[PDB]
Design a protein around this ligand. Structure first.
Ligand SMILES: Nc1ncnc2c1ncn2[C@@H]1O[C@H](COP(=O)(O)OP(=O)(O)OP(=O)(O)O)[C@@H](O)[C@H]1O
Ligand SMILES: Nc1ncnc2c1ncn2[C@@H]1O[C@H](COP(=O)(O)OP(=O)(O)OP(=O)(O)O)[C@@H](O)[C@H]1O
Lengths: 302, 406, 592, 102, 373
């Protein structure tokens, strides 16, 4: 990845002047956006090249006076819990409730109906991603952004990007749609996702999840439950093959020793289970952190 | 009279409350194995932690309370402080800690600080007890107890039983067989092995004797003539071969010594109004009220539209076999049968036939695995349907011809 | 990575901002308030049936539970407004115990009961001046012992998105004890009452009492709000027929909603008020007369130099052209009467347009327009008497001359006899001119000849194309069709197709110079069945080897591979090729 | 000592014929999985062969939960009721020795 | 409240005998199954109301959580104060001992009646075997009275429990359904004549539903309609032959119109979705059993057959995709890959064919030879 990226930007993007000019067409379009956003509209703008630098120049030239929660969506840390948490502390200048997402949603709704002219507006790079969307996820953004005192600006990238909006979900934010093209390569996405030529984020576990049997999905539920239940015990050196065999056999997920061994060696291919030989010679099993293991089978059962 | 109410009061408790009747059979060697172990763990400071496994409905609780009562009869009240736990109530660690706090009368000293290491918690409980001393831990329903998140109240009891040397018996009561294989390896390797009981039943001609010794009016005297009359009636019923027939039939379904209590309990409920000495036929119908066919009572009560529907599902096995069907193939087979018939009584129209389905789902004879024309599953037997259709009292001839065609 | 910065109004940007923005705020706020009033008036016939039904079903309580399933339209955009109006009406004439449930705040039963009792607690504690189930019954028992125990109603907004389990358990819980707590639910069925059989199984479906109501089918809702909103003389801002055609087409084809149409009208008004510096005087006529008389002279040169006025310059004589070219003092005088003529053309236009609508809606098969909307369309796309459609009306209207035509001449005359002095001054006194024709309706040739003079005077006199007939018409008319359509309803799937297939922006690239990525996609779909990785890498390597030599091979292979993998991550990323897992490698042609 | 052979040795008659039905279906299929109606049919055949009365499946499922409680076999839930996939917790030669020794 | 029995006397008598008098023990747990019609709460409430065995009645439909189920049991029991709170089960067993130490109920066998226990089945795995052993768990002379829709054989925890005593409440007989379906309270006729009506109606109607509640409802509907031509026209046979023509249609009729106006492209969307759901064994190539149901199919195939159906001025705008999302919320189309991604999954069609036929015919399209033939 790194030695691949040393060769990045060596010599010669094959046009520069029309690229600066095509970006320089869009700088006249900004005061229209400010006025249009003051009236309660919401701007999505799509594109073929990188436009988040245009958004950064935009908030440099016209958002020196207001609050802005610059929510990136390309790197795999962000879900909407972080959005609500950061907008609770770092905007409202005190912490809120902690019981549920809808409680802090309703509470952060409730803070703005009484406090006039607080004038907060975030903006989101890459509203459509593998992580940011979701019917639980997007509606919180919508219900948040439906108010008079919140003005989101987004950027969608995908071909099937307006498929995650029904009309009622569309009517929460008054969309109008801009057209942009920059041709700049999306260096933040391509930096912080992955590179195939070389911990693991949610995409490859989603891909192995959708290419396998549901019983293997129930098997890794068991193995990740036994890992997450004993995460801060330093003496927990992993289950053996026979303990995992009897605790998988009790839940009817598999029938035979050889089937579970073939399942274990095909899941040892994807580098999400590492064998550790103890002083017995028996190879115990432990996978490569803890906080990224709660997200899946949190969301696999909502 | 005095006799009928007194015999009902005195027999009803030892039957159906499983009250401590003093006769115990088949368990004398395991009891004698337990007793001196309990006496040397109780009379001396040493702590050994025996374990009992048997099937459900037999043995365990009666044995441990009987040995407990006989040990509590011996003084020096010996200050053994027994603590009764169950696997069912105390599901978690925080509940179990305050339950031991409840049993040991701890709340004179307040102890209102949650400690991190729960070995220090348990040691504090034992510590404030020991400065204030034997205890006996009766850990009932151990298989549910083996599902803690961290197996604290399993393992720390074993560690204190070896390490604190306060007098302790961790007596586990289990029901599943593999208590060792279910136990996690640090605890099962740690101190699970004290000598393990096994518990099983015995032979039928002594089981007729345990029927007689169970049924007979005790050495407690309500009135001695009525005791003699009734337990002679018990023995006269005991020597009759039809009682022996239904008892052997009960043996081969049930080696349980709990099913005998219910089977005889219904018989004793019937007796006190008239003929206070009862028949073998009264024992026979008392066995008969313990039902055998739970689903024939369901299917026999159903109306005939559901009957021809359920034999249409049976017919859906006997062509195009082994799929979880939907409504439409059921509708097609029903229409093909009713177009095989000439009369137009039973050509009931489509929304009526949905009502029999959504009534039939609540009996769970059909199973869901889209909303109304999908993938429904049948869980049933042919032969109970074939017996039920001839036992339908107002069974019409056309569904009889459907049954014979099939 | 959501980093926040803390910071630690009348800006619009000639067309000077302050009164421009106040003109905007006044016109849009006026239009929005009258839009809501004309919403709430139309549903009175609907829900004043409903107050009767709920009063009858409550009052006979001395086994059953009443449901009134509304059949609202497919437009979920405007379902909030009807429920607000219905909540208001049911709160006034019936009980102050009205709550509403949304089917997104209650996935399961605990949320259902908790939010229901919270809404009920605030609704009862306001106008008198907790997870528990029978405490709600205790709240009903405490809070209303009197006033003949007014019935609590709940409003399920969406019947459809509810899960069946929590709804079934709520209906059985409520039907168990309505001895105290009489509850009358009204779920809003989005589709049709078929699906209340689908979502509720028959035991729960048998437990209740169904009485359905219709709702306003949306075409004769939008004829009212289009007809009152823009077809009147009253609102100072009209619209171009093509922009209106765009708006009504994306109503009728895609959206079937009215709130989206008002958003499109709001956007059109906003963009018009951005657009041109003569838009400031979009007012009523004395408010136009206010500061026509004082204004900056370059905007008066703009009022000279807009092309419809230069057409008027082209049709006129020199001796007033030499003073009216440059001098402001006469230019005010002629443009004032031009704006009066604009209002004049509107005022004699629209009333006889409605007259023609009544006279054409009476016809069998109605070949001109189905409704009042499309009559605006047919008299502005083509010229109307040039077009074959009004030729077909004129061919139709001859032998329709019977007492149906005379009776509907009387009836249409009666409805604009209500509009006789509701126009109240006509620009040619056309009300009593046409009424002086229309007063001989009581006393079979006369319908024919009176028809001839009426449509000829009517349509040849005023009913004409508004741009060319009227100079200074730019101030009232906003026209930019495919500038607006892409703002309102865009197509990124066409945009990526265009800028990927033909990324020609202005030097030579139209059918190899200045992509990296369109090289990758175009060469991906030069082998247009499927692809594996390495041969595709060699093909891209070949074409940029051609790019290199039309301006060592191992370093070139390295830099070509690096820019290849930078291209191919984006070509995965943008909705094309999905990764083909567990194989050696390939990519899958997901979009054709 | 192993608990399981002593449990089979002191099991009842219908349990022993149920295990015989289990191993008979395991001789027919060869597999370790079996549904409840298959071994129910085998159990019907064996109770026919022994002069026993008719094995009603309320009794047979009560005896299924009897043997599933004691972990001689491994049981699906009783909600599935005819569709219970059962596996044998003990090896087959063990239960053959346990019903073969007398 | 009035008639305790209406001729189901033997099950009533064996249950009444099984309770016994107050000062001695009874069964731990009794389970009563049967059909939903079969009087299973009528019989036990009119039985318990006679002797006034001090009991608590619950429904498990009402208590959706465990805490409410314990709270109302303890709160209703102590009346026979504040909300005596119990978060857990062991708190209930703890406070139960203090509650059942009153002289109204010190020796009396307390009955905890549990109605519709199949909803308790999926409450927890703890609560049902914890409730079956309550006679020796707390040891305070209790008897937990179960009744259920469902069979005990699915109801067992698959570990074993204390097996309760099981009754089968029998179904109602035919002549008993003549008797107990309101031979008492006929207001204005002879009881012979109302019995003659319902005797005629019942033997016709004893094949669809034996539920006494809805049959009481249908009899009290169609009896005054039967009763008016006797008291107006005036002989049971003639109005028998008049009442059965009304009875067939009243049977059949116990859904206004299926047609729904739609925006025009949505009409064409679900036309295309039907047409690519119901014959789709790669028969895209030809034009341009049925009974098993709809086959799922991806989105781009739907867009292709959409382009083949429509006049070709369509563009893939944002609104056509937003419309095709918004059709699924109205449940006319369904995504069957539940999470397979934001990119176009299989969308299978879920509307009936006649509704599809009306939507096709209201825009100029005859498609039935085009659909599967
Ligand atoms: N050998 C025996 N002597 C006397 N009574 C016995 C004997 N075996 C079984 N019983 C009776 O069987 C029942 C056993 O109940 P107990 O609770 O002691 O064991 P269990 O029911 O298997 O344990 P669990 O309640 O954990 O299932 C009691 O009714 C007891 O009286
Ligand atoms: N023998 C009877 N005599 C008179 N009415 C009866 C009789 N049996 C049932 N009913 C009617 O049935 C009602 C009680 O219904 P039932 O007792 O059948 O409910 P249930 O069996 O508990 O219902 P579910 O099984 O669905 O919970 C009573 O209100 C009464 O109208």
């Amino acid at each position: 990845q790194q030695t691949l990226r040393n060769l990045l930007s060596k010599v010669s993007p094959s046009f520069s002047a029309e690229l600066k000019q095509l970006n320089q067409q869009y700088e006249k379009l900004f005061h229209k956006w400010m006025l249009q956003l003051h009236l309660g509209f919401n701007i999505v703008l799509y594109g073929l090249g990188s436009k988040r630098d245009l958004l950064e120049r935009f908030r440099t030239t016209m958002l020196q006076d207001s609050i802005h929660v610059v929510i990136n969506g390309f790197f795999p840390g962000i879900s909407v819990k972080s959005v609500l948490n950061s907008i609770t502390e770092e905007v409202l200048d005190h912490m809120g409730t902690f019981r549920s997402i809808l409680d802090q949603l309703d509470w952060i709704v409730n803070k703005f109906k009484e406090d006039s002219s607080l004038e907060l507006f975030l903006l989101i790079h890459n509203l459509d991603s593998q992580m940011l969307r979701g019917e639980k996820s997007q509606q919180i953004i919508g219900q948040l952004s439906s108010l008079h005192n919140i003005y989101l600006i987004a950027s969608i990238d995908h071909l099937n990007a307006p498929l995650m909006w029904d009309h009622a979900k569309q009517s929460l934010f008054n969309w109008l749609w801009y057209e942009t093209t920059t041709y700049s390569p999306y260096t933040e996405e391509t930096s912080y996702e992955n590179s195939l030529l070389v911990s693991l984020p949610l995409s490859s576990l989603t891909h192995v999840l959708r290419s396998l049997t549901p019983n293997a999905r129930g098997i890794f539920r068991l193995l990740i439950k036994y890992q997450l239940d004993n995460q801060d015990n330093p003496s927990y050196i992993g289950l053996s093959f026979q303990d995992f065999y009897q605790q998988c056999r009790e839940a009817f997920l598999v029938n035979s020793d050889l089937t579970l061994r073939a399942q274990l060696t095909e899941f040892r291919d994807h580098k999400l289970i590492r064998t550790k030989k103890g002083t017995d010679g028996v190879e115990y099993l432990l996978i490569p952190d803890n906080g990224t293991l709660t997200d899946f089978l949190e969301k696999e059962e909502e | 009279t005095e006799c009928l109410s007194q015999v009902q009061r005195i027999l009803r408790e030892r039957f159906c409350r499983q009250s401590p009747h003093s006769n115990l059979f088949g368990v004398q060697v395991q009891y004698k194995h337990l007793s001196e172990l309990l006496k040397r763990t109780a009379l001396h400071g040493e702590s050994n932690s025996v374990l009992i496994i048997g099937p459900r409905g037999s043995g365990k609780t009666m044995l441990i309370n009987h040995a407990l009562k006989e040990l509590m009869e011996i003084e020096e009240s010996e200050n053994v402080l027994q603590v009764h736990l169950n696997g069912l109530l105390q599901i978690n660690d925080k509940i179990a800690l305050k339950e031991i706090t409840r049993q040991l009368n701890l709340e004179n000293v307040v102890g209102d600080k949650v400690f991190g290491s729960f070995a220090e918690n348990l040691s504090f409980l034992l510590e404030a007890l020991k400065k204030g001393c034997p205890v006996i831990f009766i850990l009932d329903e151990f298989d549910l107890f083996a599902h803690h998140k961290n197996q604290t109240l399993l393992y720390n009891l074993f560690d204190i039983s070896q390490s604190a040397q306060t007098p302790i018996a961790v007596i586990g009561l289990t029901c599943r067989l593999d208590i060792l294989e279910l136990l996690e390896k640090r605890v099962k390797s740690r101190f699970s092995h004290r000598q393990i009981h096994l518990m099983n039943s015995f032979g039928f001609p002594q089981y007729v004797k345990i029927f007689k010794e169970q049924l007979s009016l005790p050495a407690e005297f309500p009135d001695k003539v009525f005791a003699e009359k009734w337990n002679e009636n018990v023995q006269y019923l005991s020597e009759d071969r039809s009682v022996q027939e239904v008892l052997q039939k009960h043996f081969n379904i049930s080696k349980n010594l709990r099913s005998l209590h219910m089977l005889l309990m219904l018989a004793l409920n019937r007796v006190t109004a008239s003929h206070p000495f009862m028949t073998a036929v009264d024992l026979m119908e008392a066995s008969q009220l313990c039902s055998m066919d739970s689903k024939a009572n369901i299917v026999h009560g159903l109306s005939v539209l559901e009957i021809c529907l359920i034999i249409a599902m049976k017919h859906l096995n006997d062509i195009y076999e082994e799929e979880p069907f939907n409504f439409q193939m059921v509708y097609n087979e029903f229409q093909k049968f009713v177009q095989r018939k000439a009369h137009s009584v039973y050509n009931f129209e489509k929304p009526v036939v949905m009502k029999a389905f959504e009534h039939l789902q609540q009996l769970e004879l059909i199973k869901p695995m889209q909303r109304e024309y999908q993938l429904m599953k049948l869980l049933l037997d042919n032969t109970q349907i074939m017996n039920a259709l001839q036992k339908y009292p107002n069974c019409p001839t056309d569904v009889r011809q459907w049954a014979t065609s099939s | 990575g959501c980093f926040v910065f803390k910071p630690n109004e009348d800006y619009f940007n000639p067309e000077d901002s302050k009164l421009r923005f106040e003109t905007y705020q006044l016109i849009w706020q006026q239009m929005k308030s009258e839009n809501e009033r004309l919403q709430e008036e139309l549903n009175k016939n609907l829900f004043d049936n409903l107050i009767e039904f709920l009063q009858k079903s409550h009052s006979g309580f001395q086994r059953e539970i009443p449901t009134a399933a509304l059949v609202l339209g497919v437009n979920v955009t405007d379902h909030d407004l009807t429920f607000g109006s219905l909540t208001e009406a049911l709160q006034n004439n019936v009980t102050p115990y009205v709550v509403s449930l949304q089917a997104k705040d209650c996935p399961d039963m605990k949320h259902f009961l908790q939010k229901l009792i919270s809404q009920l607690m605030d609704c009862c504690v306001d106008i008198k001046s907790q997870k528990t189930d029978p405490k709600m019954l205790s709240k009903k028992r405490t809070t209303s012992s009197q006033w003949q125990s007014p019935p609590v109603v709940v409003i399920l907004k969406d019947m459809e998105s509810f899960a069946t389990k929590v709804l079934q358990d709520f209906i059985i819980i409520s039907s168990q004890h309505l001895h105290e707590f009489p509850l009358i639910l009204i779920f809003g069925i989005a589709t049709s009452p078929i699906i209340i059989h689908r979502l509720l199984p028959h035991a729960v479906s048998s437990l209740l009492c169904i009485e359905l109501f219709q709702s306003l089918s949306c075409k004769e809702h939008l004829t009212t709000v289009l007809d009152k909103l823009l077809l009147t003389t009253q609102f100072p801002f009209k619209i171009n027929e093509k922009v209106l055609q765009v708006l009504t087409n994306i109503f009728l084809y895609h959206d079937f909603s009215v709130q989206n149409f008002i958003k499109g009208l709001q956007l059109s008004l906003l963009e018009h008020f951005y657009s041109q510096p003569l838009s400031v005087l979009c007012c009523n006529l004395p408010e136009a007369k206010r500061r026509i008389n004082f204004l900056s002279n370059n905007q008066c040169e703009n009022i000279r130099r807009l092309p419809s006025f230069r057409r008027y310059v082209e049709k006129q004589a020199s001796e007033k052209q030499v003073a009216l070219l440059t001098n402001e003092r006469y230019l005010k005088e002629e443009t004032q009467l031009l704006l009066e003529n604009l209002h004049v053309y509107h005022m004699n236009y629209f009333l006889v347009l409605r007259c023609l609508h009544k006279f054409t809606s009476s016809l069998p098969k109605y070949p001109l327009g189905r409704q009042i909307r499309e009559l605006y369309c047919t008299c502005l796309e083509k010229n109307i008497w040039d077009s074959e459609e009004y030729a077909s009306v004129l061919q139709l209207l001859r032998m329709l001359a019977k007492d149906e035509l005379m009776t509907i001449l009387e009836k249409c005359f009666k409805v604009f006899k209500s509009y006789c002095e509701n126009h109240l001054g006509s620009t040619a006194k056309r009300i009593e001119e046409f009424l002086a024709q229309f007063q001989s309706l009581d006393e079979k040739f006369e319908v024919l000849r009176e028809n001839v003079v009426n449509f000829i005077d009517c349509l040849v006199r005023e009913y004409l194309l508004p741009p060319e007939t009227q100079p200074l018409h730019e101030v009232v008319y906003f026209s930019a069709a495919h500038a607006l359509r892409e703002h309102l309803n865009a197509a990124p799937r066409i945009a990526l197709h265009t800028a990927l297939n033909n990324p020609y922006y202005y030097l030579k690239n139209e059918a190899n110079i200045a992509p990296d990525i369109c090289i990758a996609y175009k060469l991906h779909l030069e082998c247009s069945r499927l692809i594996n990785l390495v041969d595709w890498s060699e093909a891209f390597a070949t074409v940029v080897t051609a790019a290199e030599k039309m301006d060592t091979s191992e370093e070139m292979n390295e830099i070509i591979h690096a820019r290849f993998i930078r291209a191919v991550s984006e070509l995965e990323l943008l909705g094309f090729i999905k990764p083909t897992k567990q194989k050696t490698d390939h990519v899958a042609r997901l979009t054709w | 000592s192993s608990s399981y052979i002593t449990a089979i040795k002191n099991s009842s008659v219908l349990e022993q014929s149920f295990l015989r039905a289990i191993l008979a279906e395991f001789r027919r299929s060869g597999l370790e999985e079996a549904t409840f109606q298959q071994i129910y049919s085998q159990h019907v055949a064996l109770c026919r062969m022994e002069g026993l009365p008719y094995p009603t499946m309320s009794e047979t499922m009560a005896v299924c939960s009897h043997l599933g409680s004691c972990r001689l076999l491994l049981v699906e839930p009783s909600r599935n009721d005819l569709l219970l996939r059962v596996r044998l917790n003990v090896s087959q030669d063990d239960v053959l020795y346990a019903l073969k020794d007398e | 409240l009035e008639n305790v029995v209406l001729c189901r006397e033997s099950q009533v008598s064996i249950l009444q005998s099984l309770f016994g008098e107050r000062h001695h023990f009874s069964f731990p747990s009794i389970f009563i199954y049967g059909h939903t019609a079969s009087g299973k709460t009528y019989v036990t409430q009119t039985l318990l109301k006679t002797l006034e065995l001090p009991h608590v009645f619950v429904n498990c439909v009402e208590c959706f959580t465990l805490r409410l189920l314990l709270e109302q049991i303890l709160n209703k029991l102590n009346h026979l104060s504040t909300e005596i709170t119990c978060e857990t089960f062991n708190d209930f067993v703890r406070l139960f001992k203090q509650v059942t130490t009153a002289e109204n109920l010190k020796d009396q066998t307390v009955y905890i009646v549990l109605d519709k226990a199949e909803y308790l089945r999926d409450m927890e795995a703890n609560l049902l075997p914890g409730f079956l052993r309550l006679q020796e768990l707390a040891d305070r002379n209790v008897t937990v009275l179960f009744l259920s829709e469902i069979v005990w054989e699915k109801f067992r925890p698959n570990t074993g429990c204390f097996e309760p005593f099981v009754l089968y409440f029998p179904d109602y007989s035919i002549g008993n359904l003549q008797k107990i379906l309101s031979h008492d309270h006929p207001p204005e006729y002879s009881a012979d004549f109302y019995a003659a009506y319902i005797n005629i109606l019942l033997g016709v109607f004893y094949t669809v539903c034996r539920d006494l509640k809805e049959l009481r409802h249908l009899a009290v509907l169609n009896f005054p309609k039967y009763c008016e031509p006797v008291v107006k026209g005036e002989d049971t046979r003639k109005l028998w032959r008049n009442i059965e023509p009304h009875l067939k249609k009243a049977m059949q009729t116990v859904s206004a119109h299926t047609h729904v106006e739609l925006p025009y492209y949505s009409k064409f969307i679900l036309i295309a979705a039907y047409l690519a759901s119901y014959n789709p064994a790669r028969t895209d190539k030809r034009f341009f059993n049925h009974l098993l149901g709809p086959k799922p199919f991806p989105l781009d195939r739907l867009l292709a057959i959409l382009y083949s159906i429509v006049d070709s001025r369509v563009a893939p705008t944002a609104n056509i995709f937003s419309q095709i999302t918004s059709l699924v919320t109205l449940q006319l189309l369904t995504l069957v890959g539940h999470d397979d991604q934001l990119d176009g999954p299989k969308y299978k069609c879920t509307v009936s064919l006649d509704f599809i036929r009306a939507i096709a015919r209201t825009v100029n399209f005859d498609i039935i030879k085009y659909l599967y033939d």
